[PDB]
DNA sequence: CTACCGATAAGCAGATCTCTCGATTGCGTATGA
DNA sequence: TCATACGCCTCTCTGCTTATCGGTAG
RNA sequence: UAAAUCGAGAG
């Protein structure tokens, strides 16, 4: 972070939300089609995994930017899915919606009165009239139901009208733990109610039951002898992702009321009709080139794990259009049943082998199909998901420049409070002191010194972000630099700014010092920095010892350098080791002197000293 | 086969040769001090599948 | 010019940033970083190029002072000592309409574009025989049917046919 | 400290493909500094001071038609021990293509190091 | 279990102000505790 | 300072309305134009609609969508909303000064 | 998540409070020290006093509000003390529901009150008991 | 220019308005808390290494912590802390009124 | 360039457009360099000094 | 009599600090040489 | 005769969730 | 310059 490069705006939150097919469409840069990722030169291909478009690739120019590697952000593309695709998140509420549904009169088989019922709850739960949703239930008091209906839907309507009047709710709706806990507990309930009860009581027709095997194939039971009866009274296949969809956005189109506050915690202030064409991917999101590119030994070169997973997945879609195409000209020219039936029981193959293709893309688990195998590729869900994901390593947790390591070797002769640092860390270390009328003589010592006598400095960042290292520059170059330290800017636009000087750690800088495992506040404190010119440990006091709980031991800590003045007036006295005398865990004292000097103490305060 | 059983440790096998761990056969006779080289040869494991559960008998 | 005043009065509300160094000169920091350079460039927000500007005030971030305060509260941001703040100031700025009529002079004479100088300040792109045999001279009412401003300086094309 | 590191050249040309990597120097203008560390058939002398960015060995290259060197790849000063030319068990009597290199570098008891 | 709660957070629309230490630190903007749990005004002296 | 200023510290580019970071993009000048941060998403084809309009790299050309600020935020959470944007799932950024 | 906030009240990151008090009496831990040490405190009353300063934390603090409601408070317990749990309706609060500790002089624990009280009476000692009660309440502040 | 922005400008500062809480009512501490104290510290450093005039006398100061610290001591620093509620209700301190220790 | 430090964050106009009254624009052109020069060095009062003297006389 | 409602029995899914080195990377097969 | 690209090639804890055997009113 | 597995270690 650079303090002269202000930022104005500022995330204020986030919400989440399901890609529409329409917008990646408009969004993207190119389409992907064939499965080769590499030709025989390696030069990118034009419709490939590696396609220019989708960022600038080693030393190409992005097609889309028109940008370098070190330039180019990285634009998004997209594939497009022959046949509409389960996503394997949303796997279980397609299920749960697929049952617990009607096919004839496209409700659910609920009561309509029930349902609305739901809604009602749920749409005075967004606005947070957790006790309204309570008292609504006492309103039970073919044609009395619509009236029954309004009746509900009007005290509903007064209760957020009197709510949002007098200061208790505004139009974006009040969200707590207790109303979300609520929220989920009717939502729970209501599934649980949905799941439970057969004979759709809109129609009175009895629906055939659904069943899994694995999270690519579904299937249907047909109704039982008992069941095939009162079906023609009123008057275990493979079932189609497409024909699932279908019913499902049918479904939806009609129960989009209580659908609404189902898919909504809060107000649907965008008034955005939700649809069933959510839970089924007809394309699918390429990250870019540049969080696609390939692994680099000296020699040794690896391919993408996800770019492996894209390509079969092209090599299947390729597959399926291929054979569609044929089973268009079988058509056309007619032929005997089994001539079309062997190529159509190879596509519905085909068909289920992308479903477990997306599936083992997206989640690894979920992956069918192994028979030795060497390692099964981590989907996208497994490279965020474990101790080893993406939000456990690297936003809990991150590596960290401007910092050091070392052993630690005791020195009774620090103030306390300070730190050895030894000169080696002493020399790369640094912090962008800008220049000022105060700090120009410091620094241009520093500067003349240079990056190897300490104290002295290594960049020189100019008000323009230019950064004129020292490593390379005589005595005399560094003079002239440093007699051009402090000078009027030329530019209008940099005329605030003013040279930045990344002067070695100093005798007056305060730094972060840290031992494994921090298993309290005491374990990471600031000591200030006391440059002890003679070896390579970091070298600590006595008293410090009993906090971080180690011994000169061979043992091992790291040493943090803040980098602004924030930071350093933030580690000088919220986290100095000054303000550390007593610990939290009882109030007791956990520093002072440890083994030599309580014998030293008892023998020098004896009476018989003199 | 065998310099790569020996190279690895891996125990690739169709039948199992009656033993309860795969990897972790052979290790490196390391050499930073005689100790430690003849230290290589006396000693014994109760075998990889035991470093991981928690009964400590 | 053509029945126009085509100079436009229009109040913006605009979020700058204040450097730390203008700090007991605030209105006049702000008005040196961002106002002064809007100065004789185009900026398609306001609506054209502007001419300049008069009535600067700074938005206080403390509600409950007066409208009067001579002390006002600039926000500083958590990780830069800059502050940012909002701001109102009126512009005025030329606001040229397309289709409308537009008198401008002639400097600069080529073989194929005419160069025409609305105000001697409207960059745009030798005697021969015009319609009436009248020498070709600076005063004349040009078109604005087409105009360019992917360059650092906007600028018109037309012809006398309307 | 003993340390040993093989410059194994044939790495590239791992197929049945001719070599294309020799050790020593071509004829292009190759830094004439390089020769304070290396011999003359681009082998580093026998109780050599290398340190990092220091030349080791020196191969030629018949594609890019220039004189390259590896590099010494530690911050720790080390002296060149033993330097191994190591044949090929197949008969065709290949040029030099695997080099073993030995360093040693001087432990002494600075703090720190355990007792 | 970041796979399960990103669906029960995306089917409902779940909207986060990023309030507790973790959204922040992913987002990458100032804690709200400690230092981060007010703002900082300048008392400029202008006409 | 230990987390995000000097460990993934990036100054990327946001939309404001669509609240996405890595759909935004940058333009290719003409003739001594400026290459403008714009987004694709807002940005309308020319069919279907100077210092108006922006091009892709391409030659397609793209009017309207050329609002968009700047925000610091660490690079692994672009990576994780590529990722997301991988399974279906957009990630929408409010942005203060609209 | 959950964190001091400036009502003297904890709650979690998002608003819902957890306590509204930390501990019931708002008093750091590393701090607790030494406030109960009253014989220290006595012996050392001139440096104490020394580095609390009461005659510059006078302008900006009240005294007399807190004060009377304790020791209006102080007598109903004493009054009430010798009744049931269930049986003791509340009348008066206890002070540090009402007035804010950090604003209050003699806003204190019932605790810390009970215990300053016990040992001013069984300990009789130039310091009066005016002046350690009135330098105890600051430290308590 | 349309009303379409004024309009969320002018409920922007009535929210903004209905949020302050008056001086008159203000009910913090009046102390000034360690980590208000270290964040008017450090962003006073900033801005004097950032070339803001000081106030102070600079008796051979080069430590723009240490110039802020001395301001700070003599109670010369222009800053005003909002002291933020759980709410979104604010109160605006400042350095003068808010007494060290 | 384009930087936080000499281009608005957000330039939004809170009103509609207004005409200049009063039909003498030198109420604001014989006052705009009266409060400037009573650095900028791109054609800013050059190319600006042509607009004033036309509505009054000629160049 | 029989459907809604529970009360187990079983299965299923998710869990159980940092740092430094070294070593290693598949069979199997099937056609153009 | 015989080499590299294509095609795969068995001893711990907490819940939640679904299915199935008993009961009550209508 | 990579990435995974296994092995040996330090606190
Ligand atoms: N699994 C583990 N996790 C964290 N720390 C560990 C550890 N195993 C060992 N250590 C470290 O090993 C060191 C052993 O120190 P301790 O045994 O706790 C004090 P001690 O018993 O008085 O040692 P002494 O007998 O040499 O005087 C500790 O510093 C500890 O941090
Ligand atoms: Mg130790
Ligand atoms: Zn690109
Ligand atoms: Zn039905
Ligand atoms: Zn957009």
Same mark, same amino acid.
């Given at each position: 972070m650079d303090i002269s490069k202000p930022v104005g705006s500022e995330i204020t939150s986030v919400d989440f939300g399901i890609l529409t097919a329409k917008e990646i469409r408009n969004l993207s840069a190119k389409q992907i089609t064939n499965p080769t990722v590499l030709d025989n030169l390696g030069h990118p291909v034009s419709g490939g995994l590696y396609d220019l478009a989708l960022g600038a690739f080693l030393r190409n120019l992005c097609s889309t930017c028109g940008l370098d590697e070190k330039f180019c952000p990285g634009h998004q593309g997209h594939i497009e899915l022959p046949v509409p695709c389960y996503n394997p998140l949303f796997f279980n509420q397609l299920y749960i919606y697929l049952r617990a549904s009607c096919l004839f009169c496209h409700h659910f088989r609920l009561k309509s009165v029930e349902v609305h019922r739901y809604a009602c709850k749920l749409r005075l739960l967004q606005y947070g009239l957790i006790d309204e949703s309570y008292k609504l239930d006492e309103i039970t008091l073919s044609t009395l139901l619509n009236e029954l209906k309004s009746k509900r839907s009007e005290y509903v309507d007064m209760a957020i009208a009197k709510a949002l009047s007098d200061g208790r709710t505004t139009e974006r709706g009040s969200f707590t733990a207790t109303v979300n806990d609520e929220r989920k507990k009717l939502v729970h309930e209501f599934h649980k109610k949905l799941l439970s009860?057969?004979? &759709?009581?809109? &129609? *009175?027709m009895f629906s055939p039951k659904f069943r899994k095997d694995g999270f690519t194939k579904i299937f249907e039971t047909a109704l039982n002898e008992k069941q095939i009866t009162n079906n023609r009274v009123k008057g275990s296949t493979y079932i189609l992702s497409t024909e699932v969809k279908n019913i499902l956005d049918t479904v939806f189109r009609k129960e989009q009321c209580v659908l609404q506050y189902v898919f909504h915690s809060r107000p649907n202030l965008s008034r955005k009709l939700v649809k069933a064409d959510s839970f089924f991917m007809d394309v699918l999101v390429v990250p870019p080139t540049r969080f696609r590119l390939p692994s680099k030994l000296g020699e040794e070169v690896h391919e993408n794990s996800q770019n492996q997973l894209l390509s079969k997945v092209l090599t299947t879609s390729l597959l399926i259009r291929d054979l569609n195409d044929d089973l268009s000209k079988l058509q056309k020219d007619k032929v005997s049943l089994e001539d079309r039936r062997v190529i159509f029981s190879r596509l519905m193959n085909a068909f289920v082998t992308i479903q477990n293709d997306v599936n083992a893309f997206i989640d690894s688990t979920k992956a069918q199909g192994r028979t030795s195998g060497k390692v099964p590729i981590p989907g996208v869900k497994q490279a965020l998901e474990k101790k080893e994901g993406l939000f456990r390593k690297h936003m809990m947790g991150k590596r960290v420049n401007y910092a050091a390591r070392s052993v630690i070797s005791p020195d009774p002769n620090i103030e306390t409070n300070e730190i050895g640092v030894p000169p080696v860390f002493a020399v790369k270390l640094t912090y962008p002191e800008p220049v000022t009328a105060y700090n120009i003589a410091e620094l241009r010592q520093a500067v003349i010194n *240079?990056?190897?006598?300490?104290?002295?400095?290594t960049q020189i960042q100019n008000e323009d972000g230019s950064l004129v290292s020292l490593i390379g520059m005589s005595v005399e170059q560094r003079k002239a630099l440093a007699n051009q330290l402090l000078t009027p800017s030329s530019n209008v636009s940099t005329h605030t700014l003013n040279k930045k000087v990344y002067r070695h750690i100093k005798n007056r800088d305060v730094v972060l010092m840290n031992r494994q495992p921090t298993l309290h506040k005491a374990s990471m404190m600031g000591h200030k920095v006391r440059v002890l010119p003679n070896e390579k440990t970091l070298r600590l006091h006595y008293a410090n010892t009993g906090a971080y709980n180690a011994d000169f031991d061979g043992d091992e800590m790291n040493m943090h350098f803040p980098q602004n003045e924030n930071a350093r007036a933030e580690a000088l006295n919220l986290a100095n080791t000054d303000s550390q005398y007593l610990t939290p865990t009882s109030g007791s004292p956990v520093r002072g002197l440890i083994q030599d000097h309580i014998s030293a103490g008892v023998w020098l305060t004896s009476k018989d000293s003199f | 086969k065998m310099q790569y059983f020996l190279s690895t440790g891996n125990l690739v096998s169709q039948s199992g040769l009656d033993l309860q761990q795969v990897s972790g056969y052979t290790v490196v006779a390391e050499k930073i001090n005689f100790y430690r080289f003849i230290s290589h040869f006396r000693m014994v494991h109760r075998g990889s599948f035991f470093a991981q559960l928690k009964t400590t008998t | 010019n053509g029945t126009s005043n085509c100079i436009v009065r229009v109040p913006i509300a605009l979020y700058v940033s204040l450097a730390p160094?203008?700090?007991?000169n605030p209105l006049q920091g702000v008005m040196k970083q961002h106002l002064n350079p809007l100065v004789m460039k185009y900026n398609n927000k306001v609506g054209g190029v502007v001419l300049g500007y008069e009535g600067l005030k700074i938005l206080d971030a403390d509600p409950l002072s007066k409208e009067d305060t001579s002390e006002k509260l600039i926000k500083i941001t958590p990780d830069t000592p800059f502050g940012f703040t909002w701001c109102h100031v009126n512009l005025y700025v030329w606001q040229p309409q397309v289709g409308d009529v537009l008198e401008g002079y002639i400097f600069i004479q080529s073989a194929s574009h005419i160069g025409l100088l609305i105000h001697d300040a409207f960059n745009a792109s030798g005697h021969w025989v015009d319609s009436n045999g009248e020498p070709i001279d600076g005063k004349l009412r040009f078109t604005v049917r087409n105009v360019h401003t992917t360059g650092r300086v906007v600028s018109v094309d037309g012809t006398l046919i309307s | 400290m003993y340390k040993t590191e093989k410059v194994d050249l044939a790495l590239n040309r791992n197929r049945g493909d001719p070599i294309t990597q020799h050790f020593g120097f071509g004829n292009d203008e190759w830094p004439k500094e390089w020769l304070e560390k290396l011999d003359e058939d681009g082998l580093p002398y026998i109780g050599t001071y290398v340190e990092e960015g220091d030349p080791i060995c020196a191969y030629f290259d018949d594609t890019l038609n220039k004189t390259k060197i590896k590099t010494y790849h530690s911050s720790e000063p080390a002296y060149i021990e033993e330097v191994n030319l190591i044949g090929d068990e197949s008969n065709k009597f290949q040029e030099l293509q695997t080099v073993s290199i030995k360093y040693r570098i001087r432990r002494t008891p600075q703090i720190g190091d355990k007792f | 279990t970041t796979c399960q709660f990103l669906t029960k957070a995306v089917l409902d629309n779940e909207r986060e102000q990023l309030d507790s230490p973790s959204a922040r630190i992913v987002v990458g903007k100032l804690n709200n505790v400690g230092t981060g749990s007010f703002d900082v005004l300048a008392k400029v002296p202008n006409a | 300072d230990r987390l995000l200023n000097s460990s993934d510290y990036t100054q990327a580019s946001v939309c404001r309305e669509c609240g996405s970071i890595l759909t935004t993009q940058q333009s290719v000048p003409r003739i001594g134009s400026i290459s403008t941060v714009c987004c694709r998403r807002c940005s309308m084809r020319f069919e279907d609609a100077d210092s108006q309009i922006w091009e892709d790299g391409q030659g397609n050309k793209f009017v309207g969508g050329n609002e968009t600020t700047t925000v610091a935020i660490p690079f692994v959470l672009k990576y994780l909303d590529s990722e997301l944007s991988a399974m279906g799932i957009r990630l929408r950024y409010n942005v203060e000064p609209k | 998540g959950v964190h001091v906030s400036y009502d003297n009240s904890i709650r979690d990151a998002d608003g819902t409070l957890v306590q509204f008090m930390y501990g019931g009496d708002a008093i750091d831990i590393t701090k607790e020290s030494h406030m109960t040490q009253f014989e220290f405190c006595l012996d050392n009353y001139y440096a104490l006093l020394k580095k609390y300063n009461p005659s510059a934390l006078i302008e900006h603090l009240d005294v007399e509000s807190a004060l009377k409601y304790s020791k209006k408070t102080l007598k109903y317990r004493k009054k009430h003390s010798k009744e049931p749990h269930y049986k003791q309706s509340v009348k008066y609060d206890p002070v540090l529901a009402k007035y804010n500790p950090a604003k209050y002089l003699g806003s204190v624990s019932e605790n810390f009150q009970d215990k300053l009280e016990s040992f001013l009476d069984k300990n009789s000692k130039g310091v009066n008991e005016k002046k350690f009660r009135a330098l105890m309440q600051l430290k308590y502040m | 220019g349309p009303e379409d922005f004024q309009q969320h400008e002018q409920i922007r500062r009535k929210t903004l308005k209905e949020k302050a809480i008056p001086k008159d009512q203000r009910a913090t501490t009046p102390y000034m808390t360690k980590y208000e104290r270290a964040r008017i510290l450090g962003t006073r450093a900033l801005q004097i290494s950032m070339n803001a005039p000081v106030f102070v006398d600079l008796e051979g100061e080069t430590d723009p912590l240490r110039i802020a610290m001395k301001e700070l001591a003599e109670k010369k620093i222009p800053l005003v802390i909002r002291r933020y509620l759980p709410d979104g209700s604010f109160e605006d301190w400042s350095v003068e009124e808010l007494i060290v220790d | 360039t384009a930087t936080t430090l000499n281009t608005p964050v957000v330039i939004h106009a809170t009103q509609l457009p207004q005409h200049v009254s009063t039909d003498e624009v030198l109420q604001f052109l014989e006052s705009f360099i009266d409060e400037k020069e009573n650095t900028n060095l791109s054609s800013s009062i050059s190319q600006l000094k042509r607009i004033q003297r036309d509505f009054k006389g000629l160049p």
């Amino acid at each position: 972070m650079d303090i002269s490069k202000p930022v104005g705006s500022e995330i204020t939150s986030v919400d989440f939300g399901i890609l529409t097919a329409k917008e990646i469409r408009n969004l993207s840069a190119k389409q992907i089609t064939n499965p080769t990722v590499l030709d025989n030169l390696g030069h990118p291909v034009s419709g490939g995994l590696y396609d220019l478009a989708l960022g600038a690739f080693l030393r190409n120019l992005c097609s889309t930017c028109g940008l370098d590697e070190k330039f180019c952000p990285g634009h998004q593309g997209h594939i497009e899915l022959p046949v509409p695709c389960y996503n394997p998140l949303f796997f279980n509420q397609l299920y749960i919606y697929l049952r617990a549904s009607c096919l004839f009169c496209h409700h659910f088989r609920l009561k309509s009165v029930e349902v609305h019922r739901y809604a009602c709850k749920l749409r005075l739960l967004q606005y947070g009239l957790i006790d309204e949703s309570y008292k609504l239930d006492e309103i039970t008091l073919s044609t009395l139901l619509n009236e029954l209906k309004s009746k509900r839907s009007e005290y509903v309507d007064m209760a957020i009208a009197k709510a949002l009047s007098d200061g208790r709710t505004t139009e974006r709706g009040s969200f707590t733990a207790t109303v979300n806990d609520e929220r989920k507990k009717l939502v729970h309930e209501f599934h649980k109610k949905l799941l439970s009860r057969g004979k &759709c009581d809109n &129609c *009175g027709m009895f629906s055939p039951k659904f069943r899994k095997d694995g999270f690519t194939k579904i299937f249907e039971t047909a109704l039982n002898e008992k069941q095939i009866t009162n079906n023609r009274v009123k008057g275990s296949t493979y079932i189609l992702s497409t024909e699932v969809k279908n019913i499902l956005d049918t479904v939806f189109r009609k129960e989009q009321c209580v659908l609404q506050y189902v898919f909504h915690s809060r107000p649907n202030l965008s008034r955005k009709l939700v649809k069933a064409d959510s839970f089924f991917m007809d394309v699918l999101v390429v990250p870019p080139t540049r969080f696609r590119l390939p692994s680099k030994l000296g020699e040794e070169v690896h391919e993408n794990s996800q770019n492996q997973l894209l390509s079969k997945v092209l090599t299947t879609s390729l597959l399926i259009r291929d054979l569609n195409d044929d089973l268009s000209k079988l058509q056309k020219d007619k032929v005997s049943l089994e001539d079309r039936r062997v190529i159509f029981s190879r596509l519905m193959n085909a068909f289920v082998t992308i479903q477990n293709d997306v599936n083992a893309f997206i989640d690894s688990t979920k992956a069918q199909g192994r028979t030795s195998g060497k390692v099964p590729i981590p989907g996208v869900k497994q490279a965020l998901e474990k101790k080893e994901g993406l939000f456990r390593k690297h936003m809990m947790g991150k590596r960290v420049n401007y910092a050091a390591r070392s052993v630690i070797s005791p020195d009774p002769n620090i103030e306390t409070n300070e730190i050895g640092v030894p000169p080696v860390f002493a020399v790369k270390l640094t912090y962008p002191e800008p220049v000022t009328a105060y700090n120009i003589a410091e620094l241009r010592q520093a500067v003349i010194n *240079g990056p190897d006598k300490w104290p002295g400095a290594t960049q020189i960042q100019n008000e323009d972000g230019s950064l004129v290292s020292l490593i390379g520059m005589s005595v005399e170059q560094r003079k002239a630099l440093a007699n051009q330290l402090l000078t009027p800017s030329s530019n209008v636009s940099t005329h605030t700014l003013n040279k930045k000087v990344y002067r070695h750690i100093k005798n007056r800088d305060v730094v972060l010092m840290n031992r494994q495992p921090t298993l309290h506040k005491a374990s990471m404190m600031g000591h200030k920095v006391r440059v002890l010119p003679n070896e390579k440990t970091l070298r600590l006091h006595y008293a410090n010892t009993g906090a971080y709980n180690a011994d000169f031991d061979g043992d091992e800590m790291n040493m943090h350098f803040p980098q602004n003045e924030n930071a350093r007036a933030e580690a000088l006295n919220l986290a100095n080791t000054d303000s550390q005398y007593l610990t939290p865990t009882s109030g007791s004292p956990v520093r002072g002197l440890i083994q030599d000097h309580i014998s030293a103490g008892v023998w020098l305060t004896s009476k018989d000293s003199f | 086969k065998m310099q790569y059983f020996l190279s690895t440790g891996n125990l690739v096998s169709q039948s199992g040769l009656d033993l309860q761990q795969v990897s972790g056969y052979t290790v490196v006779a390391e050499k930073i001090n005689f100790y430690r080289f003849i230290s290589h040869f006396r000693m014994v494991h109760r075998g990889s599948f035991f470093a991981q559960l928690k009964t400590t008998t | 010019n053509g029945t126009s005043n085509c100079i436009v009065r229009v109040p913006i509300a605009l979020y700058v940033s204040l450097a730390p160094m203008y700090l007991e000169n605030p209105l006049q920091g702000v008005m040196k970083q961002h106002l002064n350079p809007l100065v004789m460039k185009y900026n398609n927000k306001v609506g054209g190029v502007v001419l300049g500007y008069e009535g600067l005030k700074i938005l206080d971030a403390d509600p409950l002072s007066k409208e009067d305060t001579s002390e006002k509260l600039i926000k500083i941001t958590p990780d830069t000592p800059f502050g940012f703040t909002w701001c109102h100031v009126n512009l005025y700025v030329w606001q040229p309409q397309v289709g409308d009529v537009l008198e401008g002079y002639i400097f600069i004479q080529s073989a194929s574009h005419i160069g025409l100088l609305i105000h001697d300040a409207f960059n745009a792109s030798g005697h021969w025989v015009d319609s009436n045999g009248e020498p070709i001279d600076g005063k004349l009412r040009f078109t604005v049917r087409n105009v360019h401003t992917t360059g650092r300086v906007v600028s018109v094309d037309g012809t006398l046919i309307s | 400290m003993y340390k040993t590191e093989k410059v194994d050249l044939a790495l590239n040309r791992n197929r049945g493909d001719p070599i294309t990597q020799h050790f020593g120097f071509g004829n292009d203008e190759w830094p004439k500094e390089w020769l304070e560390k290396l011999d003359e058939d681009g082998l580093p002398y026998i109780g050599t001071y290398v340190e990092e960015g220091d030349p080791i060995c020196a191969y030629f290259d018949d594609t890019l038609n220039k004189t390259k060197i590896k590099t010494y790849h530690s911050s720790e000063p080390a002296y060149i021990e033993e330097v191994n030319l190591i044949g090929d068990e197949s008969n065709k009597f290949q040029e030099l293509q695997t080099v073993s290199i030995k360093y040693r570098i001087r432990r002494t008891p600075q703090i720190g190091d355990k007792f | 279990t970041t796979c399960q709660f990103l669906t029960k957070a995306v089917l409902d629309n779940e909207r986060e102000q990023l309030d507790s230490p973790s959204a922040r630190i992913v987002v990458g903007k100032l804690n709200n505790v400690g230092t981060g749990s007010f703002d900082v005004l300048a008392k400029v002296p202008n006409a | 300072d230990r987390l995000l200023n000097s460990s993934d510290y990036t100054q990327a580019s946001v939309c404001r309305e669509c609240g996405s970071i890595l759909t935004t993009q940058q333009s290719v000048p003409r003739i001594g134009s400026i290459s403008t941060v714009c987004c694709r998403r807002c940005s309308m084809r020319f069919e279907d609609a100077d210092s108006q309009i922006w091009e892709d790299g391409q030659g397609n050309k793209f009017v309207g969508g050329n609002e968009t600020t700047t925000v610091a935020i660490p690079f692994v959470l672009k990576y994780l909303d590529s990722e997301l944007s991988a399974m279906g799932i957009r990630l929408r950024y409010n942005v203060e000064p609209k | 998540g959950v964190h001091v906030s400036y009502d003297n009240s904890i709650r979690d990151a998002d608003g819902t409070l957890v306590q509204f008090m930390y501990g019931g009496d708002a008093i750091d831990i590393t701090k607790e020290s030494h406030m109960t040490q009253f014989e220290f405190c006595l012996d050392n009353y001139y440096a104490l006093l020394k580095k609390y300063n009461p005659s510059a934390l006078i302008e900006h603090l009240d005294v007399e509000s807190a004060l009377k409601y304790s020791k209006k408070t102080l007598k109903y317990r004493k009054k009430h003390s010798k009744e049931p749990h269930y049986k003791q309706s509340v009348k008066y609060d206890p002070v540090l529901a009402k007035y804010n500790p950090a604003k209050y002089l003699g806003s204190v624990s019932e605790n810390f009150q009970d215990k300053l009280e016990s040992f001013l009476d069984k300990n009789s000692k130039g310091v009066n008991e005016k002046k350690f009660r009135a330098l105890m309440q600051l430290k308590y502040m | 220019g349309p009303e379409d922005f004024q309009q969320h400008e002018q409920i922007r500062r009535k929210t903004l308005k209905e949020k302050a809480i008056p001086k008159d009512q203000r009910a913090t501490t009046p102390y000034m808390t360690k980590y208000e104290r270290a964040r008017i510290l450090g962003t006073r450093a900033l801005q004097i290494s950032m070339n803001a005039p000081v106030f102070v006398d600079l008796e051979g100061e080069t430590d723009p912590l240490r110039i802020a610290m001395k301001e700070l001591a003599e109670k010369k620093i222009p800053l005003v802390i909002r002291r933020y509620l759980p709410d979104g209700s604010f109160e605006d301190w400042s350095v003068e009124e808010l007494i060290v220790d | 360039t384009a930087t936080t430090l000499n281009t608005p964050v957000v330039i939004h106009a809170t009103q509609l457009p207004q005409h200049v009254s009063t039909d003498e624009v030198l109420q604001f052109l014989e006052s705009f360099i009266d409060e400037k020069e009573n650095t900028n060095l791109s054609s800013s009062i050059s190319q600006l000094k042509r607009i004033q003297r036309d509505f009054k006389g000629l160049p």
